[PDB]
Structure 1
Amino acid sequence: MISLIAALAVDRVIGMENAMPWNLPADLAWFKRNTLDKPVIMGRHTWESIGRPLPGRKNIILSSQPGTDDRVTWVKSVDEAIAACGDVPEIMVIGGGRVYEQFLPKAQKLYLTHIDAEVEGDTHFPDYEPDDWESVFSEFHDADAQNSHSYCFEILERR
């Protein structure tokens, strides 16, 4: 199964200048929790945004140009990326925008962090068809001393 995981601000903004224009420790925790011990697929800009392999997960980078770091696995197509994961129960697509778009249709699950924050962005999560998804998990949280925004974790499964 292929899953997409992301954090969306208002208007589905997910990034600005290769970065997440917010500070939410709780979302990073949720991310580590739902990706640990699973292969992660990401675009190259998203690879450069992190600078180092995510610990305890197989890192697959999608790029049309030759790979430049052997600490990770480089692939040149969606199909090679999926094949590179082998036989695992779940494949986590962690971004960015152009990669989400490509993997969305093969997706069976969406892990979304809805952040109540307005932020100018240059990158947006795909405009998915709400009718095709079913909310199977929803957990809302008010802002607190560590997390400056109210946010909600949601898991959608393709109907």
Structure 2
Amino acid sequence: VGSLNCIVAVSQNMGIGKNGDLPWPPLRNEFRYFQRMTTTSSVEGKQNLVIMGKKTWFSIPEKNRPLKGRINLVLSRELKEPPQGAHFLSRSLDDALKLTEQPELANKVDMVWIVGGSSVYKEAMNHPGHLKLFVTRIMQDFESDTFFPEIDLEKYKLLPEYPGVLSDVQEEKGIKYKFEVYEKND
């Protein structure tokens, strides 16, 4: 198992979701970017694992579920088995990560990507260790009911470049946004 990473897109007022969808209209290349980053494994013969909350799972369009070319793991304490189309089910972030050190998964998994939502991000972000955040800054306010947790800039350094990540501003449907990578090691 290699890197642990969170990936998110967030509005200027820290919003990530609204009524079970994104706060903004669909941004095709943003979804492409998320797909490219989470799918691509820096090793041969391995796959990345994506970990997500139950509400995130059911926010993804059925036709993109499971997220293809990745091992999909859902967090829930109410479900008794993985949802239709998912691969694994865990009861805590720790268990999901323990599960990666299993004989079963140990040698099939390259990167682990936490793909949301709020509570999964917060726990991963406050836990000691080496962690990167891939943050798409959506450069407007949007009405939101679910928020990204505070990024403590004392611990998380914004990297001045990162391979395979564009630095300049993008725009789709009249909404500008930018890609950022943060790293901590504590």
TM-score by length of 1: 0.89
Deviation at residue 84 of structure 1 after TM alignment: 2.8
Percentage identity across paired residues of the two chains: 30
Query: What are the superposed Cα offsets for residues 22-70 of structure 1, whole Å, 9 maximum, x if unpaired?
Result: 2211211110111004100000000111132111000000000222535
Deviation at residue 4 of structure 1 after TM alignment: 0.5
Instruction: Tell me how far apart the structure 1 counterparts of residues 114 and 142 of structure 2 sit (CA, whole Å).
Output: 23
In structure 1, give the amino acid aligned to 2:73.
Answer: I
Instruction: Tell me how far apart the structure 2 counterparts of residues 47 and 147 of structure 1 sit (CA, whole Å).
Output: 25
After superposition, the Cα gap between the structure-2 partners of 1:133 and 1:64, relative to the gap in structure 1 and judged at 3 Å, is same
Query: Map of 1:82-97 to 2, 5 A cutoff?
Result: 82-85=97-100, 86-87=105-106, 88-97=109-118
| 16, 23, 39: which one aligns with 2:18 | 16
Query: Map of 1:13-52 to 2, 5 A cutoff?
Result: 13-22=15-24, 23-36=26-39, 37-50=47-60, 51=62, 52=65
After superposition, the Cα gap between the structure-2 partners of 1:90 and 1:105, relative to the gap in structure 1 and judged at 3 Å, is farther
Deviation at residue 89 of structure 1 after TM alignment: 3.9
* 2:132 and 2:182 in contact (8 A); partners too: yes
After superposition, the Cα gap between the structure-2 partners of 1:78 and 1:142, relative to the gap in structure 1 and judged at 3 Å, is closer
5+ residue gaps, structure 2, are: 40-46
Give RMSD over aligned pairs: 1.8
After superposition, the Cα gap between the structure-2 partners of 1:18 and 1:131, relative to the gap in structure 1 and judged at 3 Å, is same
Match of 2:147 in 1: 124
After superposition, the Cα gap between the structure-2 partners of 1:120 and 1:98, relative to the gap in structure 1 and judged at 3 Å, is same
In structure 1, give the amino acid aligned to 2:96.
Answer: A
* 2:13 and 2:142 in contact (8 A); partners too: no
Deviation at residue 148 of structure 1 after TM alignment: 2.6
Question: Which one has the largest radius of gyration?
Answer: 2
| 71, 79, 86: which one aligns with 2:85 | 71
TM-score by length of 2: 0.77
Deviation at residue 134 of structure 1 after TM alignment: 1.5
* 1:8 and 1:125 in contact (8 A); partners too: yes
* 1:140 and 1:150 in contact (8 A); partners too: no
Instruction: Tell me how far apart the structure 2 counterparts of residues 105 and 147 of structure 1 sit (CA, whole Å).
Output: 34
Specify the SS of the correspondent of 2:13.
Answer: helix
Match of 1:101 in 2: 122
